[PDB]
Amino acid sequence: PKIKTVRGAAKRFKKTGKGGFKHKHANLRHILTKKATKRKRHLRPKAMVSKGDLGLVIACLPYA
Amino acid sequence: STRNGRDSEAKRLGVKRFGGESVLAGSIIVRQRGTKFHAGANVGCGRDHTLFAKADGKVKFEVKGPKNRKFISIEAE
Amino acid sequence: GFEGGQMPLYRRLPKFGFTSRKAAITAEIRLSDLAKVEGGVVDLNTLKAANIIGIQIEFAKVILAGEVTTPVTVRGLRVTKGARAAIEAAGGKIEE
Amino acid sequence: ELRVYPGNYDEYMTAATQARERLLADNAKKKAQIAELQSFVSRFSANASKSRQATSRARQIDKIKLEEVKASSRQ
Amino acid sequence: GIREKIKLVSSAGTGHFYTTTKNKRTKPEKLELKKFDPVVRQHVIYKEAK
RNA sequence: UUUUGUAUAAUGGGUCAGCGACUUAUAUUCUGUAGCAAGGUUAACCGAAUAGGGGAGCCGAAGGGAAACCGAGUCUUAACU
RNA sequence: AGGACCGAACCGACUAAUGUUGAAAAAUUAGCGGAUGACUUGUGGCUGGGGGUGAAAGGCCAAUCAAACCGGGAGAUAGCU
RNA sequence: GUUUAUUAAAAACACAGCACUGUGCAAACACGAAAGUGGACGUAUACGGUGUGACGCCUGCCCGGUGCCGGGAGGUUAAU
RNA sequence: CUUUAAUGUUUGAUGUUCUAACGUUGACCCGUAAUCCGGGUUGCGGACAGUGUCUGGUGGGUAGUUUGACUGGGGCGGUCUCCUCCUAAAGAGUAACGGAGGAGCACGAAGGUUGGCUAAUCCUGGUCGGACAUCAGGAGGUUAGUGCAAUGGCAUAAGCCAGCUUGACUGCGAGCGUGACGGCGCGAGCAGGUGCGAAAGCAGGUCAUAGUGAUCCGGUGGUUCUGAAUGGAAGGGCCAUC
Ligand SMILES: [Mg+2]
Ligand SMILES: [Mg+2]
Ligand SMILES: [Mg+2]
Ligand SMILES: [Mg+2]
Ligand SMILES: [Mg+2]
Ligand SMILES: [Mg+2]
Ligand SMILES: [Mg+2]
Ligand SMILES: [Mg+2]
Ligand SMILES: [Mg+2]
Ligand SMILES: [Mg+2]
Ligand SMILES: [Mg+2]
Ligand SMILES: [Mg+2]
Ligand SMILES: [Mg+2]
Ligand SMILES: [Mg+2]
Ligand SMILES: [Mg+2]
Ligand SMILES: [Mg+2]
Ligand SMILES: [Mg+2]
Ligand SMILES: [Mg+2]
Ligand SMILES: [Mg+2]
Ligand SMILES: [Mg+2]
Ligand SMILES: [Mg+2]
Ligand SMILES: [Mg+2]
Ligand SMILES: [Mg+2]
Ligand SMILES: [Mg+2]
Ligand SMILES: [Mg+2]
Ligand SMILES: [Mg+2]
Ligand SMILES: [Mg+2]
Ligand SMILES: [Mg+2]
Ligand SMILES: [Mg+2]
Ligand SMILES: [Mg+2]
Ligand SMILES: [Mg+2]
Ligand SMILES: [Mg+2]
Ligand SMILES: [Mg+2]
Ligand SMILES: [Mg+2]
Ligand SMILES: [Mg+2]
Ligand SMILES: [Mg+2]
Ligand SMILES: [Mg+2]
Ligand SMILES: [Mg+2]
Ligand SMILES: [Mg+2]
Ligand SMILES: [Mg+2]
């Protein structure tokens, strides 16, 4: 049978132009009053999946 | 007996770039709690008293001052 | 994606974005594909009859990703700014 | 808060000063039931045969949550 | 604790608010600070709301 | 065999002979080798049927953005040194 | 007259010995209780598995009972040997 | 008298006797997806459930708690 | 139009009656040589009873399941996240059911800037006044102070007063530190708009380190980014936030 992609991981990671994946920074959903603006502002742009857990995402997304 | 068994994560303080080291701009030189090392020439001071470079060069520790206080400076060499 | 009980990476992080249905009927056109269609007219009905784009595609677009040599006349498309100069430099014509 | 009690005033007087009394009795039922589960917990706690049953009502006290009593402004 | 959350909604008409905390027991009156509104790119008054 | 460690008084076996345990299917990724090479390749099916037709379709040559959209650029931002 | 008395057939099973790869997958020997009654026995029926029946022990339901036996789901699952 | 066939035969179970309680008959209750059966070809001096257990002297105080029975004035409350 | 009576007019509530649905495990006749069943006559109940869909209560009668870990065996007691010192062997890190203490906040000023100021404790003299209040001199030197535990720090004060104020601001960010990651921390400088000061300049919260929880699901506001034939819209997305 065809490999079934993990649908949960497909909604959080996108594949870039050199094989890496981009994801959305955590800690930016609620109780955003304790946080400084500098801490919020640096969590807005998307980031790249680190090297340590780059093999945990490739397994979950065999097609994307 | 018991009523103990508490501690906190180590903060990893101490000098990062020792004397004679070639650093870049903005690189942290020493993380401190009070002001053990005072900012001298071409180094700054954070809100938590972290000393950081302001121009690329070689670190220098010196003991200038009426109260013989350690100072950190940078030579643009 | 199982790490012994702790929150897996695909669940620590938040979901973002939404999939757009308009992107599945839009296709790029390499600048080298214009010399493969017909006697010199490029449109949806000739690009998808030369197997350069799919069947359900409706909004094509010509980018600067090759080298044009023949004077083709792009009938209705969305040529880019860079690919527009290259097409006219070969004697082509762009219209709506 | 405001509660609507039908009746004129003296049919009200009973309910307002009775609903308070029945709350103090209910509030004092738990405060006397907790104090009797603490008889078991404080006695058969270190016992090997009855520990699993004393910790069954040592965590039952934590689920009663007697409701708070506020003071009337009619001082 | 006793310090609750408020939002200072701008007065320039646009929808923009800085969210902060304010103790109400000591001071029950509103807050008025001239802050920066990136929508109109000017310093305007921010009256407390919510 | 399991262990920090076994002559161990820790497990297993009375002996012989025969049988007895990393396989199969379909997908995905990496290495080797072969074919072609900005191209590579067909599936079902037709077929005097391991030939030849079949290019439906799949992968690649373009990326950025949540998206419209722009495009060797693009996103952020009122704009970026 | 008697859920009367002593006591064989008959029904049971209180004590001890033997037996424990036994003559026997609960018996033999010597004693023991009831023995006209809520007794015992022959033949044939009825009640069936979360169900039966139970003078009540979780007892008995084909040498199997805190949920029978047979076949099927089934190569259940086993982070354990 | 009965009981753990096969380590417990007993102070355990049963028992006649006592009490409470349900049931007016197409009775309560039970086995039944239902028809229907038992109770019973019985009729409250009868039948079912519960507890105690011959016989003798007796069975004291408490209705606050949890059940059960009665009340309907008032509050809260579903579908519609 | 208001308030009102009469007719009819459609409906609800209650109370008496009625037969015609329905019940009859009352009686008699037939199928029939049948205490079943069906039909007929009759009597008694009669829109009650009972059944179907929906619904509130009760429901260990019955079924599926749950009932944490560390631990000098297991249970009890203690602990589970964060901050400060020692053990920690003069870089960083380093364990035990090792030794000691704290946090789940506070502040619209207790933040920014400009101007100014320097303590504890003692002696002597002095009305109530006293070992100790307020005052005047001298010694002392930060042995004081810091919103909050401990450590490091602080005189250029980060400690103490006053004036003006909102930089406790928006978009970014060279370069580093620390984590297995999720993340957390420091940061010169650039753009736009402010505050204080004559000006040089300082200001992206507070002397620093505790004062905190991811994702999913949903709430509020803004924004055509999308809008399943088209125009809208519902619903998503992005930004701020609960
Ligand atoms: Mg959000
Ligand atoms: Mg080994
Ligand atoms: Mg061992
Ligand atoms: Mg040896
Ligand atoms: Mg030995
Ligand atoms: Mg030996
Ligand atoms: Mg051995
Ligand atoms: Mg073993
Ligand atoms: Mg052996
Ligand atoms: Mg073999
Ligand atoms: Mg693309
Ligand atoms: Mg007799
Ligand atoms: Mg027997
Ligand atoms: Mg005998
Ligand atoms: Mg006898
Ligand atoms: Mg006899
Ligand atoms: Mg028989
Ligand atoms: Mg048997
Ligand atoms: Mg079972
Ligand atoms: Mg199966
Ligand atoms: Mg098996
Ligand atoms: Mg299992
Ligand atoms: Mg006897
Ligand atoms: Mg026996
Ligand atoms: Mg016996
Ligand atoms: Mg009958
Ligand atoms: Mg008894
Ligand atoms: Mg009594
Ligand atoms: Mg159960
Ligand atoms: Mg299960
Ligand atoms: Mg344990
Ligand atoms: Mg060290
Ligand atoms: Mg060392
Ligand atoms: Mg180590
Ligand atoms: Mg302060
Ligand atoms: Mg000053
Ligand atoms: Mg200050
Ligand atoms: Mg502080
Ligand atoms: Mg539409
Ligand atoms: Mg929206």
E strand map for C38-94: 41-42, 59-62, 73-74, 93-94
Cβ <8 Å between C10 and A28: no
- Whether A22 and chain C come into contact, CB under 8 Å, resolves to no
User: Is residue C12 in some structural domain?
Assistant: no
Q: CA–CA separation, C39 vs C93, rounded Å?
A: 14
CA E22 to each of CA B19, E3, E19: distance values in angstroms, whole numbers, following the listed order: 48, 6, 10
| Other residues' Cβ atoms within 10 Å of the Cβ of residue C86 | 17
First to last CA, chain B: 59
Cα gap E44→B34, rounded to integer Å: 39
Closest nt by CA–C1' to D4:
H75
Phi, psi of D13 (to 5 degrees): -55, -35
Q: Write down the CATH number for the domain with range E1-50.
A: 2.20.28.120
Give C3 Cα–ligand 9 centroid separation in angstroms.
43
Local structure of residue E12 (DSSP, 8 states): S
Contact C2, C8 (CB under 8 A): yes
- Report CA C80 to chain centroid distance, whole Å: 11
**How was it solved?**
cryo-EM
Look at E21 and A33 and tell me if their CB atoms are within 8 Å: yes
Sort strands C41-42 and C73-74 into parallel, antiparallel or unpaired.
Answer: parallel
State the amino acid at position A6 in one-letter form. V
DSSP E strands in chain A: the ranges are: 14-15, 21-23, 47-48
Per the structure, the count of domains in chain C is: 1
**B39/B64 Cα distance (integer angstroms):** 11
| Residue C15 falls inside a structural domain | no
Task: Quote the CA–CA distance of D61 and D38 in Å, as a whole number.
Answer: 8
User: Which residues in A38-48 are b (16+ Cβ under 10 Å) and which e?
Assistant: eeeeeeeeeee
CA pair distance C74, C62, nearest whole angstrom = 9
Residue C65's nearest CA partner among C80, C55, C53 is C80
Q: Of E43, B3, E24, whose CA–CA distance to E10 is shortest? A: E43
Distance CA B45, CA B49 (A): 5
Give how far A56 is from chain C: nearest CA, Å: 6
DSSP-assigned beta bridge partners for residue E21: E5
Identify whether the C-beta of residue C28 lies closer than 8 Å to the C-beta of residue C63. Answer: yes
Task: Tell me the C-alpha distance between A34 and A27, whole Å.
Answer: 11
What is the domain-level CATH number for residue C78?
A: 3.100.10.10
Residue range(s) defining the domain that contains residue C45: 21-94
Nearest 5°: the CA angle A45, A50, A54 is 120
Tokens coding C36:
């493969």
Q: How many helices (DSSP H) and strands (DSSP E) are in chain C?
A: 3, 5
Tokens of D20: 């308070």
Torsion, Cα of A43, A48, A49, A55 (10° steps): 170
What's the CA–C1' distance between A2 and F79, in Å? 49
Measured distance CA(C23)–CA(D45) in Å, rounded: 68
Domain ranges of chain E: 1-50
| Data resolution in angstroms | 3.2
3-state secondary structure chain D: CCCCCCCCCHHHHHHHHHHHHHHHHHHHHHHHHHHHHHHHHHHCCCCCCCHHHHHHHHCCHHHCCCCCCCCCCCC
Q: Going by C-beta distance under 8 Å and a sequence separation of 6 or more, which residues neighbour residue C90?
A: C68, C69, C70, C71, C72
State how far the Cα of A56 lies from the Cα of B2, in Å rounded to an integer.
42
Q: Is E5 in CB contact (< 8 Å) with chain A?
A: yes
CB D30 within 8 A of CB D64: yes
